[PDB]
Amino acid sequence: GSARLKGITLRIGVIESVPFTIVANVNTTKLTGYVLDLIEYLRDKMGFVADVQLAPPNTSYTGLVLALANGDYDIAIGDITVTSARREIVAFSNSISDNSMRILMRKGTLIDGMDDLKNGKIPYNRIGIRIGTAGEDYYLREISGGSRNFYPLKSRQEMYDSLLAGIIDVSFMDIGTAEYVTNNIYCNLTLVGEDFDKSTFGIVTPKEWLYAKDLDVNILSLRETGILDNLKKKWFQTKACP
Amino acid sequence: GSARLKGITLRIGVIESVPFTIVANVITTKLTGYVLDLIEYLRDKMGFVADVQLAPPNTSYTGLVLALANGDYDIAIGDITVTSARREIVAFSNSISDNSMRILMRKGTLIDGMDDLKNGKIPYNRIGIRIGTAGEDYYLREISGGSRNFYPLKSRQEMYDSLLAGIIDVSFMDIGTAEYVTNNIYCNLTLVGEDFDKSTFGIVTPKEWLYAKDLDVNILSLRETGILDNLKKKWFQTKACP
Numbered sequence A: 001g002s003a004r005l006k007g008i009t010l011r012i013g014v015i016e017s018v019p020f021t022i023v024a025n026v027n028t029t030k031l032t033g034y035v036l037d038l039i040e041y042l043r044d045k046m047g048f049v050a051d052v053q054l055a056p057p058n059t060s061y062t063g064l065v066l067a068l069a070n071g072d073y074d075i076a077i078g079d080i081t082v083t084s085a086r087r088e089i090v091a092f093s094n095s096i097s098d099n100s101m102r103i104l105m106r107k108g109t110l111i112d113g114m115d116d117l118k119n120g121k122i123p124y125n126r127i128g129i130r131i132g133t134a135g136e137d138y139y140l141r142e143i144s145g146g147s148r149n150f151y152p153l154k155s156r157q158e159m160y161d162s163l164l165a166g167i168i169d170v171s172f173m174d175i176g177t178a179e180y181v182t183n184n185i186y187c188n189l190t191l192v193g194e195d196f197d198k199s200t201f202g203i204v205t206p207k208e209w210l211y212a213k214d215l216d217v218n219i220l221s222l223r224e225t226g227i228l229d230n231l232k233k234k235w236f237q238t239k240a241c242p
Numbered sequence B: 001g002s003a004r005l006k007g008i009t010l011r012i013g014v015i016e017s018v019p020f021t022i023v024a025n026v027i028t029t030k031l032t033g034y035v036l037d038l039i040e041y042l043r044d045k046m047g048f049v050a051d052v053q054l055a056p057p058n059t060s061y062t063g064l065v066l067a068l069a070n071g072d073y074d075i076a077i078g079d080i081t082v083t084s085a086r087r088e089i090v091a092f093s094n095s096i097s098d099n100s101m102r103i104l105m106r107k108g109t110l111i112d113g114m115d116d117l118k119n120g121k122i123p124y125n126r127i128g129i130r131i132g133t134a135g136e137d138y139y140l141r142e143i144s145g146g147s148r149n150f151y152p153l154k155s156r157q158e159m160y161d162s163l164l165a166g167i168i169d170v171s172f173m174d175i176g177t178a179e180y181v182t183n184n185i186y187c188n189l190t191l192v193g194e195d196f197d198k199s200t201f202g203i204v205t206p207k208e209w210l211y212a213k214d215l216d217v218n219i220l221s222l223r224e225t226g227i228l229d230n231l232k233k234k235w236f237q238t239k240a241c242p
């Protein structure tokens, strides 16, 4: 069966990631960003009541998906990659954005791209990977033959700090946020190599969800009418670094 | 609920479009292309019996979707754009490819890009549009303010013939196949301007389909492991025109 979301309250899980979901203190928390604007465009068209819930600070991406599958949220919206392993336990809406990953490194590092990680120019333990990201499964399939021998990272902040401290030489990061951060916040970090792991971001929903069609039709309408493109431009066009 | 496709016969609708689905006459018909190779990857992994059925000549893409919604096929695989109006009546799998469209014209026509269409430089009745395509939708929303004032086209063959004969000045076409045909078949046709209508292709399935998860997990695995990229290279990375 199927139903419309009008008048229904949705508990919407979101996860910190600038400029998708930007968390500010003042004591109260304020949220802004692409995701918050997207929720408003969807709410206005669909008429649901939004109960927006920020995931706890240490939540991983795969942790957010698992929390939704456990019933902690009704949907989850963010820079959440659609993967085969995740699709076993949740459904995803039609895509809100294309995606791919880039290699992140300190400016000036003598890395040309992915071959240098797959040739062994960099020992495995100098490749940092954030646990519970889609990048972890890429690493395990493409670089290490299933061996869990990357340098483990608990957060974006640990990724940035470990690069700047010379503990790792590279990590992986989604292209949209990687460009944002390296063009606006960490001016001495940079990207290298071709894009890889072409993928999509989707809204996470329960499997076999009553409201699947209503959400999908509305996402596709926002795509067709240019709203998703406008939102991307609004939040991601900036380049502060000199 | 959900289930696996093993042993089940699926009536799979396909639609002629080189090099996705290539229809050859033999003395009967033989089908080849990206779509047929994709069907074999899915069949070998999932275990269904594939009953591949070619849509009649001049069937439009929205017509194929309507035929599936009416029960004429179980799934449909092709260069089928995911749209809001189609999603109202069928579901789509996870995307098999990104997409966008380009402006197609005969070499020597004085069109520089989309602004020429939007600024009235071309008579509306000399803009050819294949009805029942996503490009028709784009036309009605962005060019004509909802007016059905284009030159209607029943197929790609009519589009090519009409451009070459000077009956129309321009049309729209998906980028992958537009590149293929202008680089390999019609050396006197060409593409101009920026690409537009960024979109996706998906496998059409019934709404609330029992086998949705099985199909999606399998598509995502083909994506992640690089099979879809390999198929795209095999069928599209070719140029004959000088």
Ligand SMILES: N[C@@H](CCC(=O)O)C(=O)O
Pocket: A061, A062, A079, A080, A081, A082, A132, A133, A134, A135, A172, A173, A174, A177
């Ligand atoms: N989009 C990623 C997280 C962000 C990143 O890896 O940069 C995921 O869903 O795992």
Ligand SMILES: N[C@@H](CCC(=O)O)C(=O)O
Pocket: B061, B062, B079, B080, B081, B082, B132, B133, B134, B135, B172, B173, B174
């Ligand atoms: N992909 C288009 C058809 C091909 C084209 O317009 O070039 C659709 O699904 O309507």
Ligand SMILES: [Cl-]
Pocket: A094, A095, B082, B094, B095, B200, B202
């Ligand atoms: Cl999609």
Ligand SMILES: [Cl-]
Pocket: A090, A091, A206, A207, A208, B002, B212, B213
């Ligand atoms: Cl499902």
Ligand SMILES: [Cl-]
Pocket: A082, A094, A095, A200, A202, B093, B094, B095
């Ligand atoms: Cl997808």
Ligand SMILES: [Cl-]
Pocket: A212, A213, B090, B091, B207, B208
């Ligand atoms: Cl549905």
